[PDB]
Design a binder for this molecule. Structure first.
Ligand SMILES: *C(=O)[C@@H](C[C@@H]1CCNC1=O)NC(=O)[C@H](CC1CCCCC1)NC(=O)c1cc2ccccc2[nH]1
Ligand SMILES: *C(=O)[C@H](C[C@@H]1CCNC1=O)NC(=O)[C@H](CC1CCCCC1)NC(=O)c1cc2ccccc2[nH]1
Lengths: 301, 299
């Protein structure tokens, strides 16, 4: 009866959320050890959103320009003792290590990969959901005003990978932000100006996983004997709004558990892209690229 | 238009593992009380036709083991067992110091709650579901997930409303409310049981279309309207649920300035077909977004 949008348990990340106020601006921050991360446009005045001088605002700030507050669970007094800038991010040093700092890394997500988001307002976690990083380096989330600094992450074993900190909503209801190295996803600009996003594409490898998920659940009308090579598919994909397909051991696993080759689904996808002939697949009349091979392997097992 | 769970940090602090003999599953530790499915007691021999009263009579307090694997690790001593419907209510020696402010309420079809899926007493995933009119949920559960808890938060109060018990013939799921009753009156026995044919959640299709109007999709909206009571009667034969208005529904009718009755006329129109057109990229009726979702996400 299909998968669900599964996100990781947010408790590790909840204990890390704080409010950062600078001047007129209030937004969320991520407190790990003696560091609080937050978008650097917390420095920007309300008048100069269109094109800020970020280097002039940082020279203009002091440790006393920033307040940090922890409201949820174990509360604390947090005093900023250093400030620095890293791409589109601020790196605030505070005088207290977070006593609930999880094991963590900073790795950038590539398009098609999924991750959990905790949506916070004024330092208060309010909801969690999962997104996939689209090929145009945007995500389809739920972000209202005040959600900036909200964090995206995945967890593997004991280690959380922080991959995303929320910065802006584009003209469509589409969102984007930074990785924790400071770069913005998509090389968008942290300035209120017109930025036109490239076209969204189908994440071919996640389409295949979803098709495998249908096959494991008894829905296999789309499977035929015919096949399309990875190389033919990747040529057709260039000309049809599809990402290039790179196989992984998670896909291979589904190929094995099912008896249906990757190439059969590559051919299937070329057919289904045109239309479903009025039939459904796992309750959809469209292709589904928002579940990964890892999602399918973990939820149907 | 996204599916959003509550932050699960509060519930994670109450998850525990409960072992009775060879069977293990998840419990919910609150105060001195640990709730879990009673079928922890059922040996594999009795899975098809379990006598729980007999199984219960056979248990001492020492037949049960409660382990806390996450947070402040510990072993709790079981000092009391009782059965409450399809749930086991054990009494332990230590009161959970992270016991949140909680209530126990039964959710009604169409209502959305958050599920914390756990395995061996360890949370592994969170998701949201709406309770279906056949009193099932379209979840994602595997072996060992029994005891995983669904809940809503009204401000600071956690309302525990679901404890997972079983997968049906379809990949569809049910469990117990914390009064101990099973949703859909399904039985805690390993026998093929029959879901009632599902219906659409009428109050949630309305909300879905109030989101469309809010997000520039008013094609279906006609000045033609149908009463609640007439739709209701129609709904009982076209597999739709009974519409019960709410405050949140009224706000989606206030600031889009559309009347509820118009949508209830549309939905009888679009149940036959969409005329080929699409609402928010969909060819069919959507019933798993609630008025509170729409209100919260399109403020
Ligand atoms: C953070 O708390 C922000 C997130 C967005 C608010 C609503 N939903 C969101 O995701 N808010 C912002 O307003 C962001 C402000 C800074 C951007 C970087 C430079 C300094 C200002 N601005 C926008 O997201 C934004 C872009 C828009 C284009 C068209 C209409 C509205 C827009 N808002
Ligand atoms: C709790 O730890 C589980 C979780 C199951 C595992 C697979 N997917 C789930 O949700 N529940 C079970 O193992 C139950 C056993 C209970 C049955 C009633 C008596 C109490 C124990 N079995 C099922 O849930 C179930 C559904 C189903 C459909 C078709 C064939 C078998 C089958 N078993």
């Amino acid at each position: 009866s299909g998968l669900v949008k599964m996100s990781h348990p947010s408790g590790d990340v909840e204990a890390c959320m704080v409010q950062v106020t600078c001047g007129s601006m209030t937004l969320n921050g991520l407190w790990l050890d003696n560091t609080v991360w937050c978008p650097r446009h917390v420095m920007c005045p309300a008048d100069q959103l269109s094109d800020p001088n970020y280097d002039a605002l940082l020279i203009s700030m002091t440790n006393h320009s920033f307040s940090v507050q922890k409201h949820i669970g174990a509360p604390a007094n947090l005093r900023v003792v250093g400030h620095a800038m890293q791409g589109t991010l601020l790196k605030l040093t505070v005088d207290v290590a977070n006593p609930s700092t999880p094991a963590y890394t900073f790795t950038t997500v590539k398009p098609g990969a999924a991750f959990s988001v905790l949506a916070c307002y004024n330092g208060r976690p309010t909801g969690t959901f999962t997104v996939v990083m689209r090929p145009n380096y945007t995500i389809k989330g739920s972000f209202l005003c005040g959600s900036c600094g909200s964090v995206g992450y995945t967890k593997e074993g004991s280690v959380i990978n922080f991959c995303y900190m929320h910065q802006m909503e584009l003209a469509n209801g589409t969102h984007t932000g930074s990785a924790f190295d400071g770069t913005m996803y998509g090389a968008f600009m942290d300035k209120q100006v017109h930025q036109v996003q490239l076209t969204d594409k189908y994440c071919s490898v996640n389409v295949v996983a979803w098709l495998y998920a249908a096959i494991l659940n008894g829905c296999a009308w789309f499977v035929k004997p015919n096949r399309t090579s990875v190389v033919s598919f990747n040529e057709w994909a260039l000309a049809n709004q599809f990402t290039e397909f790179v196989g992984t051991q998670s896909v291979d696993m589904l190929a094995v558990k099912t008896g249906v080759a990757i190439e059969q689904l590559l051919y299937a996808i070329q057919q289904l892209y045109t239309g479903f002939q009025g039939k459904q697949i796992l309750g959809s009349t469209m292709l589904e690229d928002e579940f990964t091979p890892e999602d399918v392997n973990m939820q149907i097992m």
